[PDB]
Design a protein around this ligand. Structure first.
Ligand code: NA
Lengths: 95, 95, 95, 96, 95
């Protein structure tokens, strides 16, 4: 098992490609605020053309979420925030 | 292990059948809001005869829940919301 | 591993008996509201003559709790609510 | 694996000794209120002469915490509350 | 597994170097308040050239976070608080 993480900025999708026979586990998403805002930051993941909401963050009420997410194939993280980045952390492991 | 997720819309149940000798793990349920609302979105699962509440979401107070649920047999997810979908995410694994 | 859950009603204790060499894992407790109420719903477990509080729920502030509880021997669940049931969910696994 | 739990009262530190080659996993701490109060109940553990905060409870805002704590050796639980007990629950398991 | 915990003070980074083929699992971060404050305490970790936000604590709203973090190599913890320490707790295990 190895540390993994990525910072996802406004208006940009991050593609993540697990290595063959490996997984990416996402444990947490946290706001990295840029400008003070009450905006709702909707987190999404796209896997094989399906886009699912994985939570809503906000600076004042929901600054982070703890998760038990597992990805065996390529996925794309994105969010609706414009006044924050979202930092995803977890780990890689064999599958 | 493999990524798993489903979107559950108002009024309709989603029936999920774990593959033979496999499990579905549900890790999170998150609101995908359609219209701004303070409604309570009661989440239920039906397994065998039995329907159980697995949490209450709301756009403003409880927009997601993190879970450690495991299903070995057919189950049905539904919710009482009318102004949001609920997106369930987790993973499949053996056993 | 197998799905497990129980509904615990006002004023009544629910007894749960793990089979020999099995465990019951409780993952979640959620309010199943009957009448709208601000009451505090204190959750208890009794195991071998010890009674312990395992959380306090409320419809408005704490409608559910996520847990990592393990029971290898008979136990009883009860709560102090009168305007809701509490639905406990998790799984059985080998011990 | 086996159920484990202990009640920790005001002004009483509780020593817990895992069995040899075993661990205690603490999964939850919950307030067992005695007198209605907004006090902050700071939970601490001491292991090997180091005392660390494991969380803060309160009757109104934080009545419980869910944990993934593991202790392989003797430890001591304590808290700062005077108007509640704290109930700690989890399990024992082998640790080889 | 073995108990692991560290106290991280204002203005000081804490470097951790796991043993080879071992990991540090961090399970929680909690404020150890020094003076009453509503400050936001932003938690960060550095792993090589990466620096990621791992949550935001506050004495009044977010005094602790529970998470599932894994570090296999050197890392450094820090936070932006000035009116509290942050206590990070988890366990060491083989990798
Ligand atoms: Na399994």
């Amino acid at each position: 098992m190895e540390f993994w993480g990525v910072a996802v900025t406004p208006k940009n999708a991050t593609k993540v490609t697990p290595e063959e026979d490996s997984l990416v586990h996402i444990s947490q998403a946290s706001l990295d605020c840029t400008v003070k805002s009450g905006e709702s930051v909707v987190l999404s993941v796209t896997v094989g053309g399906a886009k699912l909401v994985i939570g809503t963050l906000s600076q004042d009420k929901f600054p982070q979420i703890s998760f038990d997410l597992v990805f065996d194939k390529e996925f794309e993280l994105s969010h609706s925030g414009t006044k924050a980045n979202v930092h995803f952390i977890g780990y890689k492991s064999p599958n």
